[PDB]
PDB file of C-alpha atoms and ligand atoms in Angstrom:
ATOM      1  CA  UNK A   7       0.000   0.000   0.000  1.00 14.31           C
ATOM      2  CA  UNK A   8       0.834   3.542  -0.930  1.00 12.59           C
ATOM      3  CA  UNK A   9       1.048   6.188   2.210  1.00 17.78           C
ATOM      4  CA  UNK A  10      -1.836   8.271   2.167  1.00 14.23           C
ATOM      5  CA  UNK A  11      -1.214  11.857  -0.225  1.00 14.06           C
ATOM      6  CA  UNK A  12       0.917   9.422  -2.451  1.00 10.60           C
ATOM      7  CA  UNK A  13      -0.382   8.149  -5.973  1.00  6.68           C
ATOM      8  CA  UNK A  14      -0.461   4.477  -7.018  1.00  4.51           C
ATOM      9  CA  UNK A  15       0.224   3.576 -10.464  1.00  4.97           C
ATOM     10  CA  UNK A  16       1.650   0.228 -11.865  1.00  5.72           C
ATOM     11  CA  UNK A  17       3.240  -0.930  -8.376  1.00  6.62           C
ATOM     12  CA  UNK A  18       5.104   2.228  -7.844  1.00  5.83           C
ATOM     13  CA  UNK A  19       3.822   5.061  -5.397  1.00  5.81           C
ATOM     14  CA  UNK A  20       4.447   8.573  -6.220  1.00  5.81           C
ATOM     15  CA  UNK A  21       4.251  12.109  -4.360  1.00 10.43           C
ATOM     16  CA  UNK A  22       4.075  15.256  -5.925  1.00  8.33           C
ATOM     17  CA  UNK A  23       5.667  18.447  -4.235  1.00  8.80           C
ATOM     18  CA  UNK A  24       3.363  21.715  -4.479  1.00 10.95           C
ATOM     19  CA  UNK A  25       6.663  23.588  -3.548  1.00 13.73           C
ATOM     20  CA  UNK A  26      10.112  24.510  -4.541  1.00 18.50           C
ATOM     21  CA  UNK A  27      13.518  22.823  -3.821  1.00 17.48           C
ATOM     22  CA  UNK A  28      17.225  22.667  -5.293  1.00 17.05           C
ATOM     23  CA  UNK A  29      18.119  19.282  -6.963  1.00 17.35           C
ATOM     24  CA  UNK A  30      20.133  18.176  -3.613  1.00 18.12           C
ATOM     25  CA  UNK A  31      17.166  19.086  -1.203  1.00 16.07           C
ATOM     26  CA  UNK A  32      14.511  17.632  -3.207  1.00 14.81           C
ATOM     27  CA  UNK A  33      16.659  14.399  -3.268  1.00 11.98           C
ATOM     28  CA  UNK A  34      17.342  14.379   0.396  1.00 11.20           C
ATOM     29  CA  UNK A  35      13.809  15.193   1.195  1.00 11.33           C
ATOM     30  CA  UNK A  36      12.781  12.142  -1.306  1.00 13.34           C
ATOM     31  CA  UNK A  37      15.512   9.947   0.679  1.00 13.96           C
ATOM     32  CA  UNK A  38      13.962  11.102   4.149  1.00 10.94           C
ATOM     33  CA  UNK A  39      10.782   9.369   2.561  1.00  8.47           C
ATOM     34  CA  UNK A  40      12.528   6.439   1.801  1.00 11.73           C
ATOM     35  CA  UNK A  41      11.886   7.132  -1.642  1.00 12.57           C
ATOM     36  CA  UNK A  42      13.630   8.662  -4.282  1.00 10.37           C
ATOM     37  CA  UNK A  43      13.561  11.236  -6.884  1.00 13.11           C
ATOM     38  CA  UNK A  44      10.659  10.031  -9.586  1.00 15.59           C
ATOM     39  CA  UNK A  45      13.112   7.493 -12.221  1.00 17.99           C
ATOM     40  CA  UNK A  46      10.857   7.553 -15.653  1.00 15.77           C
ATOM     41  CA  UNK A  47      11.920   4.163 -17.320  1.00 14.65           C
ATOM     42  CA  UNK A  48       9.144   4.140 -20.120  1.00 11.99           C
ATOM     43  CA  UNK A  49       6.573   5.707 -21.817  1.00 12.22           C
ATOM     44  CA  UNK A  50       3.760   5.525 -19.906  1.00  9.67           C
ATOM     45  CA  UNK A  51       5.024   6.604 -16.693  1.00  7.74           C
ATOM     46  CA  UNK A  52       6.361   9.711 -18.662  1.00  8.40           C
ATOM     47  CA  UNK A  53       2.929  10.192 -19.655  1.00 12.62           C
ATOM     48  CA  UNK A  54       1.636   9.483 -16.085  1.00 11.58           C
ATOM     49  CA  UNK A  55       4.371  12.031 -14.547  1.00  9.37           C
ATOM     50  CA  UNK A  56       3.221  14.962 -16.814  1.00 11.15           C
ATOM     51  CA  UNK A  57      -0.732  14.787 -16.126  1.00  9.99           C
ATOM     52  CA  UNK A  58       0.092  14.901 -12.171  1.00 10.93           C
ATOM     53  CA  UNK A  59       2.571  17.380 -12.305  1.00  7.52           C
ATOM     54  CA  UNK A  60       1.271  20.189 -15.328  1.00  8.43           C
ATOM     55  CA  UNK A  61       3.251  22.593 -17.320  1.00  6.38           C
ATOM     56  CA  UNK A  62       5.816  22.738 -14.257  1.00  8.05           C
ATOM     57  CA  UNK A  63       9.563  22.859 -14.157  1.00 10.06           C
ATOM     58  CA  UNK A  64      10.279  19.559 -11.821  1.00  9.68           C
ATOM     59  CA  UNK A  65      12.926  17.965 -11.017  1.00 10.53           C
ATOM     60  CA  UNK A  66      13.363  13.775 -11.768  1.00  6.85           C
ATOM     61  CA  UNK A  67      16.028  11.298 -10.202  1.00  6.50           C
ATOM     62  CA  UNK A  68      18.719  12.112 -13.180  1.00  4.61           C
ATOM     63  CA  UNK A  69      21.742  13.696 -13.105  1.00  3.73           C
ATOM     64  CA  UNK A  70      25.407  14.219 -14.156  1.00  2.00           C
ATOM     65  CA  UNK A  71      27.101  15.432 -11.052  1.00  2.28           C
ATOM     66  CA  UNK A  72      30.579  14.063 -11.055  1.00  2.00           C
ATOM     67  CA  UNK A  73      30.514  11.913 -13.859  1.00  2.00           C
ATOM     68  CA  UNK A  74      28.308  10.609 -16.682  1.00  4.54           C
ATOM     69  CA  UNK A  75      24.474  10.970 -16.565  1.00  2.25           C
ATOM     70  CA  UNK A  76      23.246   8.372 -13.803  1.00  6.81           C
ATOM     71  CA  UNK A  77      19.580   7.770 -12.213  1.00  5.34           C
ATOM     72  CA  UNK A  78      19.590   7.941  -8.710  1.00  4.41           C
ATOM     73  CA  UNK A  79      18.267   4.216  -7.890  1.00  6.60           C
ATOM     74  CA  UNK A  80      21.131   2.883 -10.146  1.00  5.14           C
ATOM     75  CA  UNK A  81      18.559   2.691 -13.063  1.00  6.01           C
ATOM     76  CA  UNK A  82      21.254   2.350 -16.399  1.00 10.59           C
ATOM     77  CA  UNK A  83      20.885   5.663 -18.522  1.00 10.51           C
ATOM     78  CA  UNK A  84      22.587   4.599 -21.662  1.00 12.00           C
ATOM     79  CA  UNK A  85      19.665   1.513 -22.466  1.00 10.87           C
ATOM     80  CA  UNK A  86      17.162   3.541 -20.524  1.00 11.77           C
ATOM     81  CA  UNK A  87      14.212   5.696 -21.884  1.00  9.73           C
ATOM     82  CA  UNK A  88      15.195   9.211 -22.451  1.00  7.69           C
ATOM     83  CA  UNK A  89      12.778  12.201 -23.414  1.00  6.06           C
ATOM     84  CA  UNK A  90      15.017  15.021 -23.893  1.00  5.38           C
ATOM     85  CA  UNK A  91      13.905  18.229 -25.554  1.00  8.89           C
ATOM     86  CA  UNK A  92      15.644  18.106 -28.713  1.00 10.24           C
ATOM     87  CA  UNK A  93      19.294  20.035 -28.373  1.00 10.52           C
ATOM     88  CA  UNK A  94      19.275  18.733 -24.378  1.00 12.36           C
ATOM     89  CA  UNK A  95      20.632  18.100 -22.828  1.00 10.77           C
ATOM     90  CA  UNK A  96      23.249  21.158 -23.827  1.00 11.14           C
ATOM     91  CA  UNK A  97      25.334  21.532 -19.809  1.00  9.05           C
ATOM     92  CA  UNK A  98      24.974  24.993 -21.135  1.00  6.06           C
ATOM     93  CA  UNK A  99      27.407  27.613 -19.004  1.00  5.77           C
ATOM     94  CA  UNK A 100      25.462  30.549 -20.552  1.00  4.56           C
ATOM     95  CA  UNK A 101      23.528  31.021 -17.591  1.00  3.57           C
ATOM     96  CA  UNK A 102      26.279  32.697 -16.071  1.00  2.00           C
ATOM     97  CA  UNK A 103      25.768  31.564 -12.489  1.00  2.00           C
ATOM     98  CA  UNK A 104      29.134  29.245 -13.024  1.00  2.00           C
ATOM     99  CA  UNK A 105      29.471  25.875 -13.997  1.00  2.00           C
ATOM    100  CA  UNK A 106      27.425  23.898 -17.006  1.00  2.00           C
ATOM    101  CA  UNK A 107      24.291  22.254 -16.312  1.00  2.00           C
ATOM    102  CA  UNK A 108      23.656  19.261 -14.179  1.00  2.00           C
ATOM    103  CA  UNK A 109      20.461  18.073 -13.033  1.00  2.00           C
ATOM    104  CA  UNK A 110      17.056  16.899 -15.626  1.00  2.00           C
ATOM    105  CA  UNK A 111      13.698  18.395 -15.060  1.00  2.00           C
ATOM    106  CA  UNK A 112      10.777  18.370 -17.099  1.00  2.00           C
ATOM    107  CA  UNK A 113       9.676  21.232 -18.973  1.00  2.00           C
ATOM    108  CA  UNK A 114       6.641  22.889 -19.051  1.00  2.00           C
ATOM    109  CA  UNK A 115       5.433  20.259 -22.528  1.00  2.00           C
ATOM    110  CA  UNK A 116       6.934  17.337 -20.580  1.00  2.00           C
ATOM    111  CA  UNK A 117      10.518  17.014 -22.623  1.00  2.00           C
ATOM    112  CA  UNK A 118      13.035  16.824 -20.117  1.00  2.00           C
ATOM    113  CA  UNK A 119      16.018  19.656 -19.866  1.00  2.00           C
ATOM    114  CA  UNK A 120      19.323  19.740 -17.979  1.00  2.00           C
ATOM    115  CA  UNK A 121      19.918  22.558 -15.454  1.00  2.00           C
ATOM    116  CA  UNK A 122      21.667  24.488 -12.753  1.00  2.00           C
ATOM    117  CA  UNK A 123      21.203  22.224  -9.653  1.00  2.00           C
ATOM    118  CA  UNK A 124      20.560  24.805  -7.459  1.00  2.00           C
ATOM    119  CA  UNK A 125      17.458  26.605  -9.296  1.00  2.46           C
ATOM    120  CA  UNK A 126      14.432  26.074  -7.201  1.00  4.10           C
ATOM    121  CA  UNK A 127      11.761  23.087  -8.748  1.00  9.11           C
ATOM    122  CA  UNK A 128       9.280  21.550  -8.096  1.00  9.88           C
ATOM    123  CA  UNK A 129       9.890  17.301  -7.352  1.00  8.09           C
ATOM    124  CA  UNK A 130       8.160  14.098  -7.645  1.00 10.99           C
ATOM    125  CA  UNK A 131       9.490  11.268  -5.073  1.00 12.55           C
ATOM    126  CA  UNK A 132       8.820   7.298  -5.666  1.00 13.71           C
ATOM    127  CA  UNK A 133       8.775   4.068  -4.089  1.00 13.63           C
ATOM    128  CA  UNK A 134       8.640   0.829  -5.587  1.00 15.37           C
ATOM    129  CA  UNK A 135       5.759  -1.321  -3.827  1.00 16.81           C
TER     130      UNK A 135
HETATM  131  N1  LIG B   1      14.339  29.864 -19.368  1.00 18.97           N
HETATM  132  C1  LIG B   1      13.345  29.408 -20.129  1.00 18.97           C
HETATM  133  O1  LIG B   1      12.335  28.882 -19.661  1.00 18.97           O
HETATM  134  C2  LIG B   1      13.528  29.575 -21.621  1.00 18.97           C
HETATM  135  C3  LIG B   1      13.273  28.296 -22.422  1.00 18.97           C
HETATM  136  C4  LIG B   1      14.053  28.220 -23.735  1.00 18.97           C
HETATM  137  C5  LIG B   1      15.552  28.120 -23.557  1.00 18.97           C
HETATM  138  O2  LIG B   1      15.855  26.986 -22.740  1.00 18.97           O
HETATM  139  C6  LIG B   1      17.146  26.996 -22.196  1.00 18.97           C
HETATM  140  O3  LIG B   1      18.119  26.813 -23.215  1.00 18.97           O
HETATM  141  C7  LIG B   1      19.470  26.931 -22.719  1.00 18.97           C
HETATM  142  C8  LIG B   1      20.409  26.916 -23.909  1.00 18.97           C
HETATM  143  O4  LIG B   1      20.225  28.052 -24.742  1.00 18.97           O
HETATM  144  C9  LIG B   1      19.751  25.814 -21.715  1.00 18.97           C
HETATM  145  O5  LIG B   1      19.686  24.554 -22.374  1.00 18.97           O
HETATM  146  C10 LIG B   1      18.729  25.865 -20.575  1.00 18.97           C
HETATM  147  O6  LIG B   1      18.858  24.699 -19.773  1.00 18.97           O
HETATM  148  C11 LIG B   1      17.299  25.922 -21.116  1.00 18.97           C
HETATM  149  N2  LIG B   1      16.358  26.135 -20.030  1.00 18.97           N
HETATM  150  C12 LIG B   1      15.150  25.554 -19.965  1.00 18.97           C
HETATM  151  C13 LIG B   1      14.350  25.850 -18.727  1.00 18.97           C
HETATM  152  O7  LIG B   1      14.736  24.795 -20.845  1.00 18.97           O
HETATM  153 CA1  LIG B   2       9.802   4.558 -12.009  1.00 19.82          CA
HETATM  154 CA1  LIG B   3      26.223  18.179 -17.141  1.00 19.94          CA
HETATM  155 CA1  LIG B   4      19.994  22.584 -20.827  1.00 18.38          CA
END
């Protein structure tokens, strides 16, 4: 069973913040959960994701902090499904606030983006039932 406030859908449980975080807080506060942040392994949970969470900026459990891009439960990246917006992800230093781009959100149309870690998102945490 899913905690109450969490949604069930094909054996995982999700929760969907209603407030912002940077990438590391949302992750611990997903870890203080014993969850983690959301890991979107196919199509249909992509699709899930988006309807719960609107044309929002939120963070997801994929990253590329010290090394190549990973998901947080150990989920491979390389034979994994990816939605990227085309051109992402860019680590674009443009931004000018130091550094390239490390953490994946998705956009406002769904397509994931990589950015600064420390812009505040929203988050989605899951837990495998
Ligand atoms: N702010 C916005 O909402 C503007 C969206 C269009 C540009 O999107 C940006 O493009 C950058 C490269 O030119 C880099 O890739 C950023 O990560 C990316 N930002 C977002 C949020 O997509
Ligand atoms: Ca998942
Ligand atoms: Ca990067
Ligand atoms: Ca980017």
């Amino acid at each position: 069973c899913c905690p109450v406030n969490w949604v069930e859908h094909e054996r995982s449980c999700y929760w969907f913040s209603r407030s912002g975080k940077a990438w590391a807080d949302a992750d611990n506060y997903c870890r203080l959960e014993d969850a983690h942040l959301v890991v979107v392994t196919s199509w249909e949970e992509q699709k899930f994701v988006q309807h719960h969470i609107g044309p929002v900026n939120t963070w997801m459990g994929l990253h590329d902090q010290n090394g190549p891009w990973k998901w947080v439960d150990g989920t491979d990246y390389e034979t994994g499904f990816k939605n990227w917006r085309p051109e992402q992800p860019d680590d674009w230093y443009g931004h000018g606030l130091g550094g390239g781009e490390d953490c994946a959100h998705f956009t406002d149309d769904g397509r994931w983006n990589d950015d600064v870690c420390q812009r505040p998102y929203r988050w989605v945490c899951e837990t495998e039932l």
